[PDB]
């Protein structure tokens, strides 16, 4: 039971508002008419039913940078890609990013220019933008006879024939006719460019074209397939998914110009575990079963749905599987493939196809599912580091137990979303790829699970250090009133130690000379001093970069004890800290920002607006790197402001560097 592996795995990737949902809805309509987010399977022949009906695996990827994680997993799993570009917008910021994600996985892609009907929309401008901004070769498979209000259909460059769709039938019937003479003057030149590109890939067709023999349609289409697989060129088509003209043709182009599961390069991995031996799993049923888990989901009336892509081998119900990454033995049952109208149980899944295994107990996102015999570990998909963090506190105390379970469930399904409890504030901090991404997880925790919560700013971990040295600090602890009392006298010198002097940042000096303090009690004095560092006298924050010297003291034959010396050391420590200049320290982060050159002045100004101090600036072939030292308190929701300044084209990384002292206004604020 196998289709001839001519299925077209594809992913719809575009900027927000471009038309990804409208185009995919129209894709389901036309394929469904041909028959008598989430992965979907359809069946598409040609518009004239010329092509054998092929399974089309279509995923509409989310445009927002907040939901980039889903674009990443989709591009890897899907053999082909279709990039929607708005005709008015052209190459918008997010569309620039999705190109780079496709570039990372070397995914062959074609381009659909949507919204041709919209006013001030130029198909050639968008092609020009694709060539200049994305630095790629765009070839016009289809030109547009009409523009804006007068948009009436899409012309085909390869056949040099105009196509008219039927407004009454909702685009169901295609028509072929002559190109209008005004339109043809431009079509000839673009058709010549299409011919020139096809010849270059074949090399054999190049010499023939130079000699002067006309290239075959059979031969041009072949060469164009060749180059899309090479990734050298991109193919552009124009249509209106609202006026129902052009979407139908783009699908036929997808089937005739995009790769099969066999056409793409075989998945690379580590065979078994250790020695990094290349798995080299060829994409075919004979090779040992290999699959990857993407987009795990939960259904109320069904078990957890774990969408998977079988590169090689065939999986069946009642088949043992190995989770290579989690080292967990697994079994497969109740597999389901979702057609546009319905989801159906399937007993087996051939290689090159995507399905959702219900009830996979140990399968998280980025897990490799393989046969236990001959195990293979395909690499985990790229997981982006979070860019913004907020504190979540449950509105009710009862919700805390539920909230932790809910955020963990959200964190299991989505790799980008992260949750942790900071040891200092004991608060729950969540980290996400965008402000909107965190907002949607919060709404899901309320709308989906029954847990409403309060968003907040994480509490920074302040430290205390001493400025100036106070000498002769004496601390006498005496509790003698009958029987056995506890007596300890210690004279200590509290001085500010250098920040880089020692790893602990604390130094205790046994400068005792003679029998003033018995050796046995000096460790107890040291123990009391370390305990005091744990809770600073002013604001309760941990003491750091401070050292002390014990030079003198007193004792009693019966009363003196280790506990007594520890309490005396604590009294002296407090007195010395009170007189030494106590300053709170604010954690400083080393921040590196990659920004387009035009917005560098804006990003540098934003960092200067924060109490952050610039330490560096590197001009780069792509973008400009800016290095700055900014207190973490100032670094809140920085990604939102950074994206507003740079049109979401700027990314930043940070690392804790040191604890420079806070400004007085901020430090007094911390004390309160």
């Amino acid at each position: 039971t196998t289709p001839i592996a001519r299925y077209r795995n594809i992913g719809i990737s575009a900027h927000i508002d471009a038309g990804k949902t409208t185009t995919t809805e129209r894709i389901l309509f036309y394929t469904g008419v041909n028959h008598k987010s989430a992965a979907t399977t359809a069946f598409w022949s040609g518009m004239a039913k010329q092509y054998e009906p092929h399974r089309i695996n279509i995923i509409d990827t989310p445009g927002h940078v907040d939901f980039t994680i889903e674009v990443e997993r989709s591009m890897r799993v899907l053999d082909g890609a279709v990039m929607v570009y708005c005709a008015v917008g052209g190459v918008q910021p997010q569309s620039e990013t999705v190109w780079r994600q496709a570039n990372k996985y070397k995914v062959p892609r074609i381009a659909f220019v949507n919204k041709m009907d919209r006013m001030g929309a130029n198909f050639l401008k968008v092609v020009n933008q694709i060539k200049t901004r994305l630095g790629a070769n765009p070839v016009p498979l289809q030109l547009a006879i009409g523009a804006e209000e007068h948009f009436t259909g899409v012309v085909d460059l390869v056949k040099m024939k105009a196509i008219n769709w039927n407004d009454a039938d909702q685009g169901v019937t295609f028509e072929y006719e002559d190109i209008p003479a005004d339109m043809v003057e431009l079509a000839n030149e673009w058709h010549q460019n299409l011919i020139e590109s096809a010849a270059e890939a074949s090399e054999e067709l190049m010499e023939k074209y130079l000699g002067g023999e006309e290239l075959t349609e059979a031969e041009i289409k072949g060469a164009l397939r060749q180059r899309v697989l090479n990734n050298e060129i991109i193919l552009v088509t124009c249509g209106s998914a609202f006026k129902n003209k052009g979407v139908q043709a783009m699908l036929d182009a997808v089937i005739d110009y995009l790769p099969s599961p066999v056409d793409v390069p075989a998945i690379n991995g580590i065979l078994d575990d250790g020695k990094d031996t290349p798995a080299e799993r060829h994409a075919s049923d004979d090779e040992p079963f290999s699959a990857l888990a993407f987009k795990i989901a939960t259904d109320p009336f069904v078990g957890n749905l774990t969408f998977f892509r079988v590169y090689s081998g065939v999986v069946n119900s009642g088949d043992t599987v190995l989770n290579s990454v989690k080292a967990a033995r697994e079994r497969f049952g109740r597999i389901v493939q979702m057609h546009a109208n319905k989801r159906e149980e399937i007993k087996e899944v051939r290689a090159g196809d995507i399905a959702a295994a219900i009830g996979l107990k140990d399968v998280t996102t980025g897990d490799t599912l393989c046969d236990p015999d001959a195990p293979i570990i395909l690499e985990r998909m790229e997981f982006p580091e979070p860019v913004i963090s907020i504190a979540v506190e449950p509105k009710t105390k009862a919700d805390q137990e539920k909230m932790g379970l809910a955020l963990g469930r959200l964190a299991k399904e989505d790799p980008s979303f992260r949750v942790w409890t900071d040891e200092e504030s004991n608060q729950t901090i969540i980290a996400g790829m965008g402000e909107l991404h965190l907002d949607i997880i919060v709404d899901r925790m309320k709308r989906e699970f029954n847990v409403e919560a309060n968003v907040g700013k994480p509490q920074v971990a302040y430290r205390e250090t001493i400025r100036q040295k106070v000498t002769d600090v004496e601390g006498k602890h005496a509790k003698q009133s009958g029987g056995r009392g506890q007596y300890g006298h210690v004279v200590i010198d509290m001085y500010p130690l250098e920040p880089g002097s020692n790893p602990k940042g604390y130094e205790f000096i046994n400068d005792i000379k003679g029998g003033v303090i018995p050796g046995e009690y000096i460790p107890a004095v040291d123990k009391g001093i370390q305990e005091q560092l744990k809770a600073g006298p002013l604001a309760g924050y941990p003491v750091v970069d401070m050292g002390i010297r014990l030079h003198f003291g007193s004792y009693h034959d019966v009363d003196s004890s280790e506990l007594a010396f520890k309490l005396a050391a604590s009294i002296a420590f407090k007195e010395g800290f009170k007189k030494a200049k106590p300053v709170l320290l604010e954690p400083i982060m080393k921040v590196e920002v990659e920004t387009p050159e035009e917005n560098t002045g804006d990003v540098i100004g934003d960092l200067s607006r924060r109490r952050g101090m610039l330490k560096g600036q590197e001009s780069e072939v792509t973008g400009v790197k800016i290095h700055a030292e900014v207190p973490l308190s100032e670094m809140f929701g920085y990604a939102t402001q950074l994206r507003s300044l740079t049109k979401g084209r700027a990314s930043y990384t940070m690392e804790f560097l040191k604890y420079d002292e806070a400004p007085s206004n901020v430090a007094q604020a911390v004390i309160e």
């Binding site: 580091e385 979070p386 963090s389 992260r418 942790w420 900071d422 200092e424 504030s425 608060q427 901090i429 980290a431 994480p458 509490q459 920074v460 971990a461 302040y462 430290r463 604010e586 954690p587 982060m589 973490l632 308190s633 670094m635 809140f636 940070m654 690392e655 804790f656 604890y659």
Partner: peptide
């Protein structure tokens, strides 16, 4: 207390 890299 303040970002996925742990730190204050």
């Amino acid at each position: 207390x303040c970002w996925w890299g742990x730190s204050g």
